[PDB]
Design a binder for this molecule. Structure first.
Ligand code: NA
Length: 129
């Protein structure tokens, strides 16, 4: 499933991401746009053998287990397959853990690259939230 920005915004708001750890809803929607292009099924292979999974491209070397990544941790204590659901619950739960013990949303390179410091509210304008 590929989310439209407004449908995703509503889902992220439902799961409590609006202002989670101080980051407005727009930041989370923007992150998803440039990380996975709002695609819940997207995956990306990396040079270290890890793979990024889902709507928020969560990495298997640190956050989830796919059993094929050398030197992993699984800090979100979840199989990476759960991060490929049409429902974003699992990804949100892991994202909350990632932003809480880390360097804010800088954990998402695409957010740092394309969202940080910009008019992220543009991602929720025109929406019925
Ligand atoms: Na892992």
């Amino acid at each position: 499933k590929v989310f439209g920005r407004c449908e995703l915004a509503a889902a992220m708001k439902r799961h409590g991401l609006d202002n989670y750890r101080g980051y407005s809803l727009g930041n989370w929607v923007c992150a998803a746009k440039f990380e996975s292009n709002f695609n819940t099924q997207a995956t990306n292979r990396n040079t270290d053998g890890s793979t990024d999974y889902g709507i928020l491209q969560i990495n298997s070397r640190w956050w989830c287990n796919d059993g094929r990544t050398p030197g992993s941790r699984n800090l979100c204590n979840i199989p990476c397959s759960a991060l490929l659901s049409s429902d974003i619950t699992a990804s949100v739960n892991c994202a909350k853990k990632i932003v809480s013990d880390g360097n804010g949303m800088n954990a998402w390179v695409a957010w740092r690259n394309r969202c940080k410091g910009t008019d992220v509210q543009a991602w929720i304008r025109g929406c019925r939230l």
